């Protein structure tokens, strides 16, 4: 009750008192205002000029409680808008928080970890500034224990979260040397048994692999792919989501990087992913498949072997539209790179009817994508002299009706592709 619901005016009076206990009491009152459920008065606290005082309190080794209260207050200011986070940084908080990482008081060290994560979480500039002030070494030192399970759960979760923010964002991506410095600790966190730590570790990995092939390679070379595939089969959606995100990112890389995903057994999980009740998981999984079918013929063959073509037919037939689009891309990629035999297999699995039904879409690019796939499939039928059987299959399911109509479509490319298909096969 003593420090509950103070006015900002009263907080200022206590902080300007030069009585350390009065200052502590007022800092706690500020912390409570900034910790309330609704609409913390962050701007009012900033406008009152309190940040420089809070920052000074961080350095009071002799009074650990005011260190904690001010770290908490500053954490919450930094949790706000970019302008609010900037106010904290502008007050000199970064080095002050880094100094607290070494505190003998675990709850203070943890609060500093948290504050630094909010700062880094603002964007690449503040992320990189936190790194330049030397945060990585002391952060990693806190996790340098024989067994992570000895750490307090909350403490470990906060450390993992802050590390993930240091891996986050691009333009630019985090410094290469910082990434190399963090990765081994991250790989270790990825093997921990706490669902929250696992989720954030997967998120960190997903950020690191969201980039050019060189960034992907740094992660893949650490040998984490098999563990990612294991997490891909997790029961918890908060783990599956970032695990799948990372796996998808990895397969945007070279064909060799993709093979690592296949070799680790990722494809066996796709029957479940491609029918997952969460729309986003189906979409991400189908996008991922589309990048796998963009690979080598031996990689398309593994998609075939794992029985995934019927699942792609399923998604084309019925799924959220965004997912059906990724499915269309998966098919066009498949038909572009596949062998005649692989392409023929596509038709036998029933690809043609759901492809035709999607020509009723108002999305211009997926019509292009679908028309491309049909061209590709026809090309394969040519080599077999079976073009006629395909033309009929397409007309029987109403596909010819759709294509002919697409000659008076206002997009140039579909105009051409349409007439050309008619001209050649109908």
């Amino acid at each position: 009750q003593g420090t509950v619901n103070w006015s900002v005016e009263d907080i200022v009076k206590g902080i300007n008192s030069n009585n350390l206990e009065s200052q502590l009491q007022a800092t706690q009152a500020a912390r409570k205002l900034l910790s309330r459920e609704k609409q913390p008065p962050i701007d009012n606290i900033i406008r009152a000029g309190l940040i420089p005082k809070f920052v000074s309190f961080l350095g009071k080794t002799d009074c650990s409680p005011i260190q904690f209260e001010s770290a908490w207050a500053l954490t919450n200011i930094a949790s706000g808008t970019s302008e609010q986070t900037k106010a904290v940084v502008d007050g000199g908080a970064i080095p002050a928080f880094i100094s607290l990482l070494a505190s003998p008081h675990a709850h203070i060290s943890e609060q500093a970890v948290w504050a630094l994560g909010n700062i880094a979480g603002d964007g690449s500039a503040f992320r990189d500034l936190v790194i330049k002030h030397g945060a990585i070494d002391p952060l990693l030192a806190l996790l340098a224990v024989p067994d992570l399970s000895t750490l307090a759960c909350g403490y470990l979760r906060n450390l993992t979260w802050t590390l993930s923010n240091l891996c986050r964002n691009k333009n630019p991506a985090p410094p290469l040397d910082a990434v190399e410095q963090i990765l081994p600790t991250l790989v270790r966190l990825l093997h921990h048994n706490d669902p929250e730590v696992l989720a954030d570790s997967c998120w960190a990995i997903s950020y690191l692999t969201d980039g050019p092939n060189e960034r992907i390679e740094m992660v893949v070379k650490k040998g984490v792919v098999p563990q990612l595939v294991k997490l891909l089969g997790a029961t918890e959606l908060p783990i599956v989501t970032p695990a799948l995100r990372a796996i998808g990112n990895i397969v945007t890389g070279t064909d060799e990087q993709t093979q690592k995903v296949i070799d680790a057994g990722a494809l066996a999980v796709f029957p479940s992913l491609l029918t997952n009740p969460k729309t986003n998981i189906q979409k991400e999984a189908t996008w991922t498949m589309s990048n796998i079918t963009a690979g080598r013929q031996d990689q398309i063959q593994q998609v075939v072997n794992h029985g995934l073509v019927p699942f792609l037919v399923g998604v084309l037939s019925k799924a959220d539209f965004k997912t059906q689009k990724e499915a269309a891309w998966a098919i066009t990629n498949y038909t572009s790179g596949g062998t005649v035999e692989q392409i023929v297999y596509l038709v036998h699995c029933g690809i043609i009817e759901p492809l035709m039904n999607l020509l009723s879409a108002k999305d211009t690019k997926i019509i292009q994508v679908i028309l491309d796939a049909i061209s590709n499939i026809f090309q394969a039928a040519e080599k077999l002299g079976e073009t006629e059987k395909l033309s009929i299959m397409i007309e029987e399911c109403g596909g010819l009706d759709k294509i002919e109509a697409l000659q008076r479509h206002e997009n140039e490319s579909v105009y051409k592709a349409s007439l050309n298909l008619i001209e050649k096969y109908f």
Binding site: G117, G121, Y207, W329
Partner: peptide, 23 residues
Amino acid sequence: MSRRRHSDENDGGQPHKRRKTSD
């Protein structure tokens, strides 16, 4: 024919910052 993530999409929707409301 690989397609990387579109520049207009976010990195997955996770909170960038966290406010501490309890101890």
